[PDB]
Amino acid sequence: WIPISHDNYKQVQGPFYHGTKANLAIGDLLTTGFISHFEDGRILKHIYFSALMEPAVWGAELAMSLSGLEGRGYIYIVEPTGPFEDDPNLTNKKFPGNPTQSYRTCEPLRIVGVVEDWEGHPVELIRGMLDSLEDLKRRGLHVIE
Numbered sequence: 783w784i785p786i787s788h789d790n791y792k793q794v795q796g797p798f799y800h801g802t803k804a805n806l807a808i809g810d811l812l813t814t815g816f817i818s819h820f821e822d823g824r825i826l827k828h829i830y831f832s833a834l835m836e837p838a839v840w841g842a843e844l845a846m847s848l849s850g851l852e853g854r855g856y857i858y859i860v861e862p863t864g865p866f867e868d869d870p871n872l873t874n875k876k877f878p879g880n881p882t883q884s885y886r887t888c889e890p891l892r893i894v895g896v897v898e899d900w901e902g903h904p905v906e907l908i909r910g911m912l913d914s915l916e917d918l919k920r921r922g923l924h925v926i927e
């Protein structure tokens with residue numbers, strides 16, 4: 783397993799997926815739903831995406847739940863427009879390496895397509911992460927812009 787950094791992200795093949803509450807068209811830039819999060823003594827602002835579909839399904843479900851909104855989110859096929867790196871939240875935490883192929887970037891995502899069809903996770907599965915994210919939100923440690 784090879785860590786993805788600003789030195790080697792160009793070696794990562796798409797496609798990529800992003801889950802969100804944002805309602806945008808193909809060709810639009812995602813400048814919304816960046817996450818302000820605490821890391822190494824400061825707030826950083828990143829948008830998150832994956833080379834696999836399922837992490838974006840989680841991203842859409844949690845975007846909708848944290849926003850208190852009804853229904854399924856949106857999943858976009860995306861390209862980063864600047865350097866990206868492993869999401870440290872999902873890298874050498876619960877699993878070795880970055881098995882969900884989840885990445886973060888400081889620059890907007892380009893929407894290049896839409897995912898229409900997916901099977902969601904049961905809400906019970908979403909509740910434990912939502913509880914944790916609600917607390918981090920209250921503490922200003924992870925905040926959707």
Ligand SMILES: CO[C@H]1/C=C/O[C@@]2(C)Oc3c(C)c(O)c4c(O)c(c(/C=N/N5CCN(C)CC5)c(O)c4c3C2=O)NC(=O)/C(C)=C\C=C\[C@H](C)[C@H](O)[C@@H](C)[C@@H](O)[C@@H](C)[C@H](OC(C)=O)[C@@H]1C
Nearest residue numbers: 837840841871872873875876877881882884910911914915
């Ligand atoms: C694609 O990721 C998803 C599913 C992966 O599928 C799956 C199978 O692969 C996972 C990987 C590779 C992990 O590394 C991981 C993990 O590191 C983690 C929790 C569980 N966290 N919590 C719930 C259990 N509770 C005891 C502790 C808090 C996980 O479940 C997973 C996990 C999975 O379930 N982290 C922790 O336990 C700790 C120490 C802190 C958590 C902090 C916040 C809450 C999270 O970081 C937020 C910012 C998000 O990152 C997640 C919600 C992910 O949603 C997205 C869209 O990113 C989600 C895991």
Ligand SMILES: CO[C@H]1/C=C/O[C@@]2(C)Oc3c(C)c(O)c4c(O)c(c(/C=N/N5CCN(C)CC5)c(O)c4c3C2=O)NC(=O)/C(C)=C\C=C\[C@H](C)[C@H](O)[C@@H](C)[C@@H](O)[C@@H](C)[C@H](OC(C)=O)[C@@H]1C
Nearest residue numbers: 817818819820821822823870871914918921922923924925
């Ligand atoms: C008393 O301890 C606190 C210090 C407060 O004050 C303050 C100013 O000083 C801090 C120090 C000195 C840290 O060293 C620190 C830190 O190392 C860290 C996060 C924040 N972590 N996350 C932010 C969200 N993001 C999506 C995931 C990573 C922090 O906020 C802090 C932090 C503060 O905020 N984390 C990480 O580096 C990594 C790599 C992962 C952590 C994973 C989970 C999420 C955490 O373990 C959860 C379960 C909590 O245990 C902490 C958040 C503590 O919060 C409480 C109330 O217990 C906090 C350390």
